[PDB]
Amino acid sequence: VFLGFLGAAGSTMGAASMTLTVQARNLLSTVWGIKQLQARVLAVERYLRDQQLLGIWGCSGKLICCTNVPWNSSWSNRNLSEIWDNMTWLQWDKEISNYTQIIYGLLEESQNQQEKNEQDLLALD
Amino acid sequence: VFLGFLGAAGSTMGAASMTLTVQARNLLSTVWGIKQLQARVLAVERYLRDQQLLGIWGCSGKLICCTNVPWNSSWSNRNLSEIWDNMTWLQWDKEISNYTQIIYGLLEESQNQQEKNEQDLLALD
Amino acid sequence: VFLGFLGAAGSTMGAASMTLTVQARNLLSTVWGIKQLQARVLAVERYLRDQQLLGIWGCSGKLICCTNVPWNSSWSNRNLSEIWDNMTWLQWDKEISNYTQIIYGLLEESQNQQEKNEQDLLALD
Amino acid sequence: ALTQPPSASGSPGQSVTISCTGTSSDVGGYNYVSWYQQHPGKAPKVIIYEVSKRPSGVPDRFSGSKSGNTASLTVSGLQADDEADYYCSSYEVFGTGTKVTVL
Amino acid sequence: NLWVTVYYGVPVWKDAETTLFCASDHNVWATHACVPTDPNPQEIHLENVTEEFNMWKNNMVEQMHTDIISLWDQSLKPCVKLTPLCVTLQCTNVTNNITDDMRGELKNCSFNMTTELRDKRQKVHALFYKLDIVPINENQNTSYRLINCNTAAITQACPKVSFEPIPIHYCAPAGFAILKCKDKKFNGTGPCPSVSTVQCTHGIKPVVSTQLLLNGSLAEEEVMIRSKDIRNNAKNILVQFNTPVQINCTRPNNNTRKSIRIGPGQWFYATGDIIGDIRQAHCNVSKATWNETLGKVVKQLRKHFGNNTIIRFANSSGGDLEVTTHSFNCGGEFFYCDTSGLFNSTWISNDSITLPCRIKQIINMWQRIGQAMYAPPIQGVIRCVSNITGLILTRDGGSTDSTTETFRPSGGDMRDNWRSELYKYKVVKIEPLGVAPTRCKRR
Amino acid sequence: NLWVTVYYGVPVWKDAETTLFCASDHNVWATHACVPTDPNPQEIHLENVTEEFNMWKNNMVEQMHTDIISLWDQSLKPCVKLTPLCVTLQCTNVTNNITDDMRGELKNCSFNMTTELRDKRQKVHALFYKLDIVPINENQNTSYRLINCNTAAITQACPKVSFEPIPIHYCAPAGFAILKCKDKKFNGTGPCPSVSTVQCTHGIKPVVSTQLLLNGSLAEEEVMIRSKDIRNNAKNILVQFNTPVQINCTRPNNNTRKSIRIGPGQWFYATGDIIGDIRQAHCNVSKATWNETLGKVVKQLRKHFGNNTIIRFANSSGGDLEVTTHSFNCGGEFFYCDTSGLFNSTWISNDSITLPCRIKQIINMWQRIGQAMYAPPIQGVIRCVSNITGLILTRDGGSTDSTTETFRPSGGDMRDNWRSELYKYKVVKIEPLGVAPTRCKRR
Ligand SMILES: *[C@@H]1O[C@H](CO)[C@@H](O[C@@H]2O[C@H](CO)[C@@H](O[C@@H]3O[C@H](CO)[C@@H](O)[C@H](O[C@H]4O[C@H](CO)[C@@H](O)[C@H](O)[C@@H]4O)[C@@H]3O)[C@H](O)[C@H]2NC(C)=O)[C@H](O)[C@H]1NC(C)=O
Ligand SMILES: *[C@@H]1O[C@H](CO)[C@@H](O[C@@H]2O[C@H](CO)[C@@H](O[C@@H]3O[C@H](CO)[C@@H](O)[C@H](O[C@H]4O[C@H](CO)[C@@H](O)[C@H](O)[C@@H]4O)[C@@H]3O)[C@H](O)[C@H]2NC(C)=O)[C@H](O)[C@H]1NC(C)=O
Ligand SMILES: *[C@@H]1O[C@H](CO)[C@@H](O[C@@H]2O[C@H](CO)[C@@H](O)[C@H](O)[C@H]2NC(C)=O)[C@H](O)[C@H]1NC(C)=O
Ligand SMILES: *[C@@H]1O[C@H](CO)[C@@H](O[C@@H]2O[C@H](CO)[C@@H](O)[C@H](O)[C@H]2NC(C)=O)[C@H](O)[C@H]1NC(C)=O
Ligand SMILES: *[C@@H]1O[C@H](CO)[C@@H](O)[C@H](O)[C@H]1NC(C)=O
Ligand SMILES: *[C@@H]1O[C@H](CO)[C@@H](O)[C@H](O)[C@H]1NC(C)=O
Ligand SMILES: *[C@@H]1O[C@H](CO)[C@@H](O)[C@H](O)[C@H]1NC(C)=O
Ligand SMILES: *[C@@H]1O[C@H](CO)[C@@H](O)[C@H](O)[C@H]1NC(C)=O
Ligand SMILES: *[C@@H]1O[C@H](CO)[C@@H](O)[C@H](O)[C@H]1NC(C)=O
Ligand SMILES: *[C@@H]1O[C@H](CO)[C@@H](O)[C@H](O)[C@H]1NC(C)=O
Ligand SMILES: *[C@@H]1O[C@H](CO)[C@@H](O)[C@H](O)[C@H]1NC(C)=O
Ligand SMILES: *[C@@H]1O[C@H](CO)[C@@H](O)[C@H](O)[C@H]1NC(C)=O
Ligand SMILES: *[C@@H]1O[C@H](CO)[C@@H](O)[C@H](O)[C@H]1NC(C)=O
Ligand SMILES: *[C@@H]1O[C@H](CO)[C@@H](O)[C@H](O)[C@H]1NC(C)=O
Ligand SMILES: *[C@@H]1O[C@H](CO)[C@@H](O)[C@H](O)[C@H]1NC(C)=O
Ligand SMILES: *[C@@H]1O[C@H](CO)[C@@H](O)[C@H](O)[C@H]1NC(C)=O
Ligand SMILES: *[C@@H]1O[C@H](CO)[C@@H](O)[C@H](O)[C@H]1NC(C)=O
Ligand SMILES: *[C@@H]1O[C@H](CO)[C@@H](O)[C@H](O)[C@H]1NC(C)=O
Ligand SMILES: *[C@@H]1O[C@H](CO)[C@@H](O)[C@H](O)[C@H]1NC(C)=O
Ligand SMILES: *[C@@H]1O[C@H](CO)[C@@H](O)[C@H](O)[C@H]1NC(C)=O
Ligand SMILES: *[C@@H]1O[C@H](CO)[C@@H](O)[C@H](O)[C@H]1NC(C)=O
Ligand SMILES: *[C@@H]1O[C@H](CO)[C@@H](O)[C@H](O)[C@H]1NC(C)=O
Ligand SMILES: *[C@@H]1O[C@H](CO)[C@@H](O)[C@H](O)[C@H]1NC(C)=O
Ligand SMILES: *[C@@H]1O[C@H](CO)[C@@H](O)[C@H](O)[C@H]1NC(C)=O
Ligand SMILES: *[C@@H]1O[C@H](CO)[C@@H](O)[C@H](O)[C@H]1NC(C)=O
Ligand SMILES: *[C@@H]1O[C@H](CO)[C@@H](O)[C@H](O)[C@H]1NC(C)=O
Ligand SMILES: *[C@@H]1O[C@H](CO)[C@@H](O)[C@H](O)[C@H]1NC(C)=O
Ligand SMILES: *[C@@H]1O[C@H](CO)[C@@H](O)[C@H](O)[C@H]1NC(C)=O
Ligand SMILES: *[C@@H]1O[C@H](CO)[C@@H](O)[C@H](O)[C@H]1NC(C)=O
Ligand SMILES: *[C@@H]1O[C@H](CO)[C@@H](O)[C@H](O)[C@H]1NC(C)=O
Ligand SMILES: *[C@@H]1O[C@H](CO)[C@@H](O)[C@H](O)[C@H]1NC(C)=O
Ligand SMILES: *[C@@H]1O[C@H](CO)[C@@H](O)[C@H](O)[C@H]1NC(C)=O
Ligand SMILES: *[C@@H]1O[C@H](CO)[C@@H](O)[C@H](O)[C@H]1NC(C)=O
Ligand SMILES: *[C@@H]1O[C@H](CO)[C@@H](O)[C@H](O)[C@H]1NC(C)=O
Ligand SMILES: *[C@@H]1O[C@H](CO)[C@@H](O)[C@H](O)[C@H]1NC(C)=O
Ligand SMILES: *[C@@H]1O[C@H](CO)[C@@H](O)[C@H](O)[C@H]1NC(C)=O
Questions:
Q1: CA nearest neighbour of E125 among E108, E138, E143, E140
Q2: In whole angstroms, what is the distance from residue F385 CA to residue F401 CA?
C-alpha cells in the first residue's frame, strides 16, 4: 500500500490527480500500549472528519467531485494551464490556504443544501 | 463549529430541517487518559452506526433522503402542516419513539434490498 | 441484531446474498479496560478499511455493487448455476482467495479511476 | 569590541540616539543585538532585544535599528528617569557604555 | 400520499449518562491531564425549549465526586510515606506563653526517628495538636501515639502541591451536550422554560467544606432553598445566597517548617516551634451581614413551612468533627471552626462574630479506610478571606411543637456541595437520525 | 467559466507534532511492546520536492528523550531495591597487589546486612569504588556511606536486562509521514532539495554517552559541522565524521559476582574480589587516525571561523563527572574516561592514545531527583570495541585573542546525541482534501 505514497508530491496537479487512491489508502491504519492506541484513534477521527466533509458536500464516496460553486478570481486568477500543467499541489495549497474556509462554506451552505432541498421538492411532483 | 448547535431544537420541523449540517458537524470530535479515549472511541462507534443505518438504507452520504416506504396512519394521522409548520422535532420524536423500529425495519428490509436486487437485474438486461 | 447471523453460511450464494444486512450490522460494536478498548478500535479500523475499499471502487453505500471489470475465465470457469445455485460463499472464497488481489487491483485502477475521470470530462461539455 | 560613545545628552521632550559600532565585519552576526539600561545602583534591565523588539512592559519610547556594522537606540520622549548607563550587547560582548544626561 | 423521509442532523436528544471530560485554564486536581480550556466558549440559547431538570439525579455530581477522590489519591501516591512515625511519643505541655484558649491544645512531643542510615537513629522533637495525639495508656505515663497508628497508614502531602481550589470545567464528548437552565428562580427540580446549550460548565472550584458553601455561585436575585423533599427531614436543604457573606479566617501563630531526614531521600516536615505568642485560630464574620442573610433565609423558609411558623437555628446535634464544625482547607491548613454562634437564633414572624477554630495536621479526607494524610505545616501566618455563598441545613424531625421549625448545620457528604454548583446542568445525548412523512418519493 | 472541484487524496502536507510509534527487529527499551519491524521497508523518493528541515526544532528528539527516560524508569521499576544498604560501612584499602594508577580507587568495605529472617543479620564485605563512597565524618574513623544515601533511594538494576543498545525505528501513524533529507552536504537547517518519504527511520541505537558520539551514523562524504547558531557559544557544535575512529575500551580486572540474600527473595550483587592483579580501566584510540580526524574537523571549522584562524582543542573546563569525562556504558559497566589527551592540540593554518577510565557502580542517569541505580558487577573481563562517529564541542566565548578559537568537549544533554541521528528526519501530517478550479460542473 505504502509503495508510491506521495510520489506525485512534486508532480503537476494534473499528473498528481491520477494517484489519489495511493494517498487515500495510506490515511487509515505500559503506557506505550495506550499512546499508540490514541494515535490509532486519532487517525480514525481525522479520516471520518474528512469523510464527513465529503458527505455534507455532495461528494460522498468520490475522490474527484464536481460541484456547483463558481470559482472566484479573488481566490485565484491563474489559468488552467498554470494550475494543472505548470503547478504542484503544495504550491496551490500554500496560496489557497488563505481562502479555503470561504470555499468550504460555499460548498457546505448554498450548493449542497439548496440542491438537496430541490431534490426533496422534485421527488414529490 | 459549535456555534448554532441545537439552536432549532425549539423551532418547527420545517425550519429545523435547514440546520442539519450544524448538528451533523458536532457528532464527531493516569486513568483520565484512558476514559477520555474511551469516550472518543464511543463517539466514533455511534457515528458509524448511524452511517451504517444510512448505508443499509439508500441514504448514504445524504442528510435528507427520500424513500419508497409509504407512511402509515397508525404511526401518525397528523397533517403535514401539523408536523412541519406547527410542531418541533422533540415532540415528533416523543410520539414516534413507539413506532421507530417498525419504520426502520421497513426501510431496511423491503425497500432497499428489493430496490438493490432490481437494479442488479436491470443492469444485466 | 445478532439473530440470524451467519445463518446462510451453509446456504447457496444466491440464497445467501439476500441476508447481507444481517452480516453487515454485526461488524460494528485494570488492563482489561484497555485491551477491550483496543479491540473496539480494531473493529472500527477494519470496518473503515472495507468501506474505504468500497469508496475507491464505485461501491460506496451499497451492499450489492455492479462494476465494469469483465470476469476472467482464468479466475473461474464455473457457470452461474454452479456458483449461485450449487455453491456456498465459503467454497467460493476458498477458490478465489488466489485471485482476489488481481480483481481488487482491476476494480481499483482501470474501471473506477477511468470512469471518474470520464465523468470529470463529461461534466464540462 | 562594541564601541559606544562615552556620553550622550538630551532635553526633556526631544529625542536622543545612542550608537554602537562593531569592529568585526558584518558576517550576519548582528541579528541578535540587545540593549540594557542600568539605573545607578541597580542591576541592568533589557530595553531592546534583537535590534528592534521590546520586552512586554517596556514603553514604546525606546526603539533601536541597525545599519551594517553600526546599530543604534533611539530614546524618543526623554524624561528625567533616563539618567542611566546604556549598554549594547551582541551575545557575550557588552558595549562600552553611554551615560545619558538629562538637561 | 405520504412517504417516509430520513433526516440526519435532527436537533433531538435523550437523557444520558456518560464520562464528561475536563477543561482548565503541581496541583491536586492534576490540571496537566485536564485539557486546556478555550477562550470565549460558546453559549447558545435554545428558544421555545422547555427541558426537565433534576439536580437530585444528576450524574455529573457522582462523576465529580469520583473524580475528586481519584485525583486526591493520585496526588497522594508519589508523596513521602510516614509509616516510620508510628513510634512512642513522649509529650509535654508547651512551655511558651500560651493563651487560655490554647492551653493544652498543642503538645511538644519527642521521639526516636530513623535516619538515612538504617543503623542510626536521631532524637527529635515536634509540636503536635491535641486532635492528632492519643494517650497510649490510661495511666499518666506521658507516652502518646499518633491518632491513626492503630487503624490506618499515613502519607505526607507533598509540600510542592498547593491545596488552593482552582476552577474546573466539565465538558461533554462529541455526540453529547450539556444543557444549562437559565431560569433565575429555579427550585432545582422540574421543567425549565429557559435553556441553553454549552460546550462546558462554568468554572467550578471543588472547594471541600462542611456546613458552609465557600467560594461558590450566588443566586441571581433571591435566596434559593432547594431540597429533594422539603417534607423529608432525612434530606439536606441547600441554601444558595444572593449576596456573599465575607468570612476572614486566620491562624495567628507564626510557624516554622523543620525538615527531618527519615530515609535516604525522604523528608518529614514538623512544626518545630512558634515564634512569638501562641493564639487560637479563628474566623470572623460581620454580625449585621450574617443577621440580614439569616433574615432572608428565614423569609424563604417560611414559603415552605408557613408564614406564622417560628424558624430557629441551632448548632449541630452530633457527628464527627468534620460535620459538627465548619471544616475547610485554606492556606494549606485545615480549620475546624465552631459555628455555634452562627446558628443561635429564634425568628418569630412579627461588631463581628468570632468562631474559634481548631487545627489538625492528620486528616482523613472523606471516609476512606486505611489511608490518612499528614498535612505539613505552613511557614508564616495564614490569613484567608472567603465568600460564604450558601448553607447545608438539616431540619429537626420528630418535633413536639408544630409552631416552630429548627434547622441545624450538616454536611460531610461532598456531593451536596458539588450539587450546589452542578444543579443547573444536565447531560443529554444527541439523536441526529429521524424519520418523518413528506410528499417526496424515491425514484 | 471555472467551478470548484473537490479532490481527496491530494499529496499535500503540513508541519506537525504527533506521537510516533516504535518498530524493532529482557531489554531496557522494552522491545516486546515495540511493534515488530517489517522486512525491506519502502523508501520513496520525492522528485522535484524541496522541503525545509530544522533539526533544532524537531519534535522527534524530544519524543525520543522522553521515551528513553520512561523506558529506563519502567525497566527499573520491578528490580530489587537496595534501600537497606544505607548503613555504616567500615572501609579499608585493598590488600592485593594494586597498581599506582588504582592505589586508593577501590576500597574493601564491611557491613552488617539484613537476611531473609528479620531477626537475623549477616556480616558481609564488598568491594566499592572510591567514586561511590563518601566519608561519614571528617575525622579518621574509617566509617563511610554510599554516595546517594542522603539524597536519593537506590535501586539495583536487574542482572538479566542487558544494557546493549539495539537499533530502534520511529514510525509515523496513519495520516502522518516521515520525510528524510537525502542531501549528503546538509548543514542541518534550511531547504533540502532531495527528499524521500519513509515508513520509519533507520535503525537508531539509543547510545548514551558524552563528548563522543559512539556507534552512530557516518557522514557520506565530508565531516559535517552542525550548530543552531555558529556565532552563539552557548550552543553546542555537533561534528559528524565521514570515517569512524575505532576506540577500544577495557576493564582489565577479572571480576566475580557475589550474591547476598538481603530479603525473602531479594539478592544484592557485590563485587566481592578480583582474581589476579588490579589494573585501571582505559580506552585506546589510534594516534594517527585521531590526528587525521582532527585535521578534517579543523578544515571544516575554518569554513565558519576563517581560513587563517588558529583552531585549538582543549579539555572540558568544568561540570560534573558525566560531562568533564567521556561517560559511557559498555559491557554492563559504566566508564568515565579522561579525554584530556584527545583534545590537547593547536592547529595553525600553515602509536596509540590511552585515556584512563574510572568506574562507578552507583549511577544517576540524566539528572532525576531521588532515584539512583546500582550497577551490578559483570563477571570476567570486559573488552569493548566502538566506533567514534562524531563529537559534541563547545566553543570558548569571551576570547581576548581573535586569531585563535578554542573548542572543548561538552555533553550531558542526550538530546544533542539523539539529534545527531534524527537530524535528517521530519514529521508531517497529510492534507488529502483540496479544492481547485476545473471546467466540470455538477449536473
Ligand atoms: C476562596 O477564595 C479566596 C480567593 O481566591 C482564597 O484565598 C486565597 O488563598 C490563596 C491560597 O491560600 C492565597 O494565596 C497565598 O497567599 C499567600 C500570602 O502570603 C502566599 O504566601 C501563598 O503563596 C505561598 O504558598 C503557595 C502554595 O499555597 C506557594 O505556591 C507559594 O510559592 C508560596 O509559598 C499564596 O499565594 C490567596 O492570597 C488568598 N486570597 C485572599 C484574597 O485572601 C480562599 O482560600 C478560598 N477559600 C477556600 C475555602 O478555599
Ligand atoms: C558499539 O557497538 C559494539 C558492537 O555491537 C558494542 O560492542 C559489543 O558489546 C556487546 C555487549 O557489551 C558485546 O556482547 C557481549 O560479549 C561478551 C564477550 O564475552 C559476552 O560475554 C556477553 O554476553 C554476556 O552478557 C550478556 C549481557 O550483556 C548476556 O546476555 C549473556 O548471556 C552473557 O552473560 C555479550 O555477548 C559484544 O561482543 C561487543 N562487540 C564487540 C565487537 O566488541 C559496543 O558496546 C557498542 N558501544 C556502546 C558504547 O554501546
Ligand atoms: C520541646 O522540647 C524540646 C526538648 O525535648 C526543647 O528543646 C530544647 O529547648 C531548650 C530551650 O532552652 C534548649 O536549651 C535545648 O537545647 C533544646 N533541646 C534540644 C534537644 O533541641 C524545645 O525547645 C521544646 N519546644 C517547645 C516549643 O516547647
Ligand atoms: C576484604 O576484607 C575481608 C574481611 O573484612 C577479607 O576477608 C577475609 O580474608 C582473609 C584473607 O586471608 C580470610 O582469611 C578471611 O577468612 C576473610 N574473612 C571473611 C569474614 O570472609 C577479604 O579478603 C578482603 N578482600 C579484599 C579484596 O581485600
Ligand atoms: C520532475 O520534473 C521534471 C521536469 O523538470 C519531469 O520530467 C519529471 O517527470 C518530474 N518528476 C515527477 C515525479 O513528476
Ligand atoms: C469574490 O470575492 C470577493 C471578495 O474577495 C467578493 O466580494 C465577490 O463578490 C466574490 N465574487 C463572487 C462572484 O462570488
Ligand atoms: C495565462 O496564460 C498566459 C499565456 O501567455 C500566461 O502568460 C499568463 O501568465 C497566464 N495568466 C495567469 C493569470 O496565470
Ligand atoms: C493570505 O494572507 C496571508 C497573510 O495573512 C498571506 O501570506 C497569503 O499569501 C494570503 N493569500 C494570498 C493568495 O496571497
Ligand atoms: C419561537 O417561537 C416564536 C413564536 O412564538 C417564533 O417567532 C420564534 O422564531 C421561535 N424561535 C425559534 C428559535 O424558532
Ligand atoms: C399500519 O399499521 C397497522 C398496525 O398498526 C397494520 O396492521 C397495517 O397493515 C399498516 N398499514 C400499512 C398500509 O402498512
Ligand atoms: C389537519 O388540519 C386541520 C385544518 O382544519 C386541523 O384542524 C386538524 O387538526 C388537522 N388534523 C390532524 C389529524 O392533524
Ligand atoms: C407508545 O406506547 C407508550 C407506552 O408503552 C406510550 O407512552 C406512547 O405514547 C405510545 N405511542 C403513541 C403514539 O401514543
Ligand atoms: C441445507 O441443504 C438442504 C439440502 O440438502 C436445503 O434444503 C436447506 O435449505 C439448506 N440449509 C440452508 C440453511 O440453506
Ligand atoms: C486472464 O488472466 C490471464 C492470466 O491468468 C491473463 O493473461 C489474461 O489476459 C486475462 N484475460 C483477460 C480477458 O483479462
Ligand atoms: C456448466 O453446466 C453444465 C450443465 O450440464 C455442467 O455439467 C458443467 O459442469 C458446468 N460447467 C462448469 C465449468 O461449471
Ligand atoms: C491458488 O494457489 C494455491 C497454492 O498456492 C492453491 O491452493 C489454490 O487452490 C490456487 N487456486 C486455485 C483456483 O486452484
Ligand atoms: C498539661 O496540659 C493538660 C491538657 O491536655 C492539662 O490537663 C494538664 O494539667 C497540664 N499539666 C501540667 C501543666 O503539668
Ligand atoms: C529513645 O531511645 C532511647 C534509647 O536509645 C530511650 O532511652 C529513649 O527513651 C527513647 N526516646 C523516646 C522519646 O522514646
Ligand atoms: C420544586 O417544585 C416541585 C414541583 O414542581 C416540587 O416537587 C419540589 O419539592 C420543589 N422543591 C422545593 C425545594 O420547593
Ligand atoms: C515570622 O517569623 C519570621 C522569623 O524570621 C519573621 O521573618 C516573619 O516576619 C514573622 N512573620 C510574622 C507574620 O510575624
Ligand atoms: C476578629 O475580631 C476580633 C474582635 O476583637 C479582632 O480582635 C480580631 O483581630 C479579628 N480577626 C481578624 C482575623 O480579622
Ligand atoms: C475581612 O477582611 C477585609 C479585608 O480583607 C475587611 O475589609 C473586612 O471588614 C473583614 N471582615 C470581617 C468580618 O472582619
Ligand atoms: C436582624 O434582622 C432582623 C430583621 O428580621 C431584625 O429584627 C433584628 O433586629 C436584626 N438584628 C441585628 C443584631 O441586627
Ligand atoms: C451546641 O451548643 C450546646 C449549647 O447550646 C453545647 O452544649 C454543645 O456542645 C454544642 N455542640 C456543638 C457540636 O458544638
Ligand atoms: C447563644 O445565644 C445565647 C443567648 O440566647 C448566648 O447567651 C450564648 O452566648 C450564645 N452562644 C454562642 C456559642 O454564641
Ligand atoms: C465574593 O463575591 C464578590 C461579589 O460576587 C466577588 O467580587 C468576589 O471576588 C468574591 N470573593 C471571592 C474570594 O471569591
Ligand atoms: C589508603 O588509601 C587512601 C586513598 O584513599 C590513602 O590516602 C591512605 O594513605 C591509605 N592508607 C593506608 C595504606 O594506610
Ligand atoms: C556489626 O554489628 C556489630 C554488633 O552486632 C558491631 O560490633 C559491628 O561493628 C558492626 N559492623 C560494622 C561493619 O558496622
Ligand atoms: C546552515 O545554513 C543556514 C542558512 O541556510 C544558516 O542559518 C546556518 O547557521 C547554517 N549552519 C551552519 C552550521 O553553518
Ligand atoms: C577469571 O577468573 C576465572 C576463575 O574461575 C577464570 O576461569 C577465568 O578464565 C578468568 N578470566 C580471565 C579473562 O582471566
Ligand atoms: C592500549 O595501549 C597500551 C600501550 O602500551 C597497551 O599496552 C594496551 O594493551 C592497550 N590496550 C588495549 C585494550 O588494547
Ligand atoms: C582495537 O582492536 C582491534 C581488534 O578488535 C584492533 O585491530 C585495533 O588495532 C585496536 N585499536 C587500537 C587503537 O588499539
Ligand atoms: C596530524 O596531521 C597534520 C595534518 O594537518 C600534520 O601536520 C601532523 O604532523 C599530524 N600529526 C601526527 C602526529 O600524525
Ligand atoms: C584539563 O587539563 C588541565 C591541564 O591542562 C588540568 O589541570 C585539568 O584538571 C583538566 N581538566 C579535566 C576536566 O580533566
Ligand atoms: C598535553 O600536551 C602537552 C604538550 O602540549 C603534553 O606535555 C601533555 O602531556 C599532554 N597532556 C595529556 C593529558 O595528554
Ligand atoms: C564501524 O564502522 C565500520 C564502517 O562503517 C562498520 O563496518 C563497523 O561495523 C562499525 N562498527 C561498529 C561497532 O558499529
A1: E108
A2: 40
State the amino acid at position B111 in one-letter form.
Q
Distance, CA of F5 to CA of F441 (rounded, Å): 8
Residue pair F9/A28 in contact by the 8 Å Cβ criterion: no
Domain ranges of chain A: 6-122
Q: For residues D36 and D23, what is the distance between their CA atoms, to the nearest angstrom?
A: 20
If one counts every other C-beta atom within 10 angstroms of the C-beta of residue D10, the result is 19
Closest residue by Cα to atom 2, ligand 12, is B98
End-to-end CA distance of chain F: 15
How far apart, in whole angstroms, are the C-alpha atoms of residue D51 and residue D58? 14
Q: Which three cell numbers stand for residue E328?
A: 475547610
Which residues partner with F273 through β-bridges? none
Report the distance separating Cα C66 and Cα B118, nearest Å: 12
Is C60 in contact with C51 (CB distance < 8 Å)?
yes
Output the CA–CA distances (angstroms, integers) from residue F352 to E336, E374, F246, F281, in the order listed. 76, 62, 11, 16
> For chain B, how big is the Rg over CA atoms in Å?
18
Angstrom distance (rounded) from CA A6 to CA F180? 13
Q: What are phi and psi of E290, to 5 degrees?
A: -65, -35
Resolution (angstroms) equals 2.8
Look-up of cell digits 545612542 = D18
* HSE of F371, CA atoms in CB hemisphere, 13 A: 13
d(CA F200, CA F210): 26
- The answer to whether E87 contacts chain B (CB < 8 Å) is no
Ligand 10 and B72: CB distance under 6 A: yes
| Single-letter code of the amino acid located at F274 | I
Interface size between A and F, measured as CB pairs under 8 A: 177
d(CA C57, CA B56): 18
Q: How far is CA C125 from CA A68, A107, C118, F441, in A?
A: 15, 22, 11, 9
Cα E121–Cα E127–Cα E129 angle in degrees, nearest 5: 130
Residue entry with cell 474505504? C52
> Kind and range of the H or E element at A103?
helix A100-106
Q: Are A35 and A18 in contact (CB under 8 A)?
A: no
Contact E167, E113 (CB under 8 A): no
**What are the counts of helices (DSSP H) followed by strands (DSSP E) for chain D?**
0, 10
Helix, coil or strand: residue F179: strand
Residues F80, F374 contacting (CB under 8 angstroms): no
Cα E360 to Cα E370: distance, rounded to the nearest angstrom: 18
Which triple of cell numbers denotes residue C69? 471489470
- Ligand 25 binding pocket, CB closer than 6 Å: E 340-341, 344
Burial E385-408 (b: 16+ CB within 10 A, else e): ebbbbbbbbbbeeeeeeeebbbbb
Asked whether the beta carbons of residue A121 and residue E438 sit closer than 8 angstroms, the reply is no
Q: Cα–Cα distance between E196 and B113 in angstroms, integer?
A: 42
Ligand with minimal distance to B81 CA: 11
Question: How many whole angstroms separate alpha carbon E159 and alpha carbon E182?
Answer: 41
What experiment produced this structure? cryo-EM
**F100 CA distance to ligand 36 middle (Å):** 35
Burial class (CB in 10 A: 0-12, 13-18, 19+), D66: middle
Closest by CA position to E418, among listed E201, E246, E250, E243: E201
The closest-lying atom of ligand 36 relative to the alpha carbon of residue F218 is 5
- Grid cell 465538558 — which residue? E171
Rounded to whole angstroms, the Cα distance separating F320 from B66 reads 76
Closest CA to F265 of F79, F27, F77: F79
For residue A93, what is the enclosing H or E element? helix A89-96
Q: Give the residue, out of A72, A75, A101, A106, with the most ligand 6 atoms within 8 A of its beta carbon, to mutate for a pocket test.
A: A72
